[PDB]
Amino acid sequence: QFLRTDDEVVLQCTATIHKEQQKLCLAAEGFGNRLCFLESTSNVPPDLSICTFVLEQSLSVRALQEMLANTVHRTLLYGHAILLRHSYSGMYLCCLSTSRKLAFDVGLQEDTTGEACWWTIHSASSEGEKVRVGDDLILVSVSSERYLHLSYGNSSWHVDAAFQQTLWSVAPI
């Protein structure tokens, strides 16, 4: 099928270290420090509740930038900028100002009147083309131009906005 607005989705990525490969799910809590993290699966994550986002909006870069400039179930299209609402908290995936150290932190917030909560979707291989479920998506922050990135810390996997890309699977469920 195709990805549409109002869809409840789950973002997954593949984490391979020491030849050990696993699927990780993007997750977040609204109760406290508003940062996203990653869950292991199996491919179903233990706690799926907090791994659900809704594709609330889909606009063109020009449109979004026009709407914002004035202030001073559609199908998702490649190159378009989207808005992912976190179901549990009702807040939105955003690119923050604080650093993870070249990368920025990824978290949740409420105010969507800005670029920080907008992510343009690109293909790994299609401008304007329809976004089909099962495709590997690259997510770029409109505000910072950084990628939603799979990072590896001391002992665990983290998610941030870095200069390097990561392929994500935006599955419905």
From Swiss-Prot:
Record PTM: Channel activity is modulated by phosphorylation. Phosphorylation is increased in failing heart, leading to calcium leaks and increased cytoplasmic Ca(2+) levels.
Domain annotation MIR: ranges: 73-124, 128-173
Disruption phenotype: Embryonically lethal. Embryos die at about 10 dpc, due to defects in heart tube development. Cardiac myotubes display enlarged rough endoplasmic reticulum and cytoplasmic vesicles that contain high levels of Ca(2+).
Effect caused by changing V142M: No change to global protein fold or protein stability. Alters local protein folding
Location(s) in or outside the cell: Sarcoplasmic reticulum membrane
Tissue-level expression: Highly expressed in heart, lung, cerebellum and brain. Detected at lower levels in adrenal gland, stomach, thymus, esophagus and ovary.
Subunit composition and interactions: Homotetramer. Can also form heterotetramers with RYR1 and RYR3. Interacts with CALM and S100A1; these interactions regulate channel activity. Identified in a complex composed of RYR2, FKBP1B, PKA catalytic subunit, PRKAR2A, AKAP6, and the protein phosphatases PP2A and PP1. Interacts directly with FKBP1B, PKA, PP1 and PP2A. Interacts with FKBP1A and FKBP1B; these interactions may stabilize the channel in its closed state and prevent Ca(2+) leaks. Interacts with SELENON. Identified in a complex, composed of FSD2, CMYA5 and RYR2.
Domain observations: The calcium release channel activity resides in the C-terminal region while the remaining part of the protein resides in the cytoplasm.
Membership in a protein family: Belongs to the ryanodine receptor (TC 1.A.3.1) family. RYR2 subfamily.
Protein's job: Cytosolic calcium-activated calcium channel that mediates the release of Ca(2+) from the sarcoplasmic reticulum into the cytosol and thereby plays a key role in triggering cardiac muscle contraction. Aberrant channel activation can lead to cardiac arrhythmia. In cardiac myocytes, calcium release is triggered by increased Ca(2+) cytosolic levels due to activation of the L-type calcium channel CACNA1C. The calcium channel activity is modulated by formation of heterotetramers with RYR3. Required for cellular calcium ion homeostasis. Required for embryonic heart development.
Listed name of the protein: Ryanodine receptor 2
Organism from which the protein derives: Mus musculus (Mouse)
Residues of the full protein shown: 12 to 217 of 4966
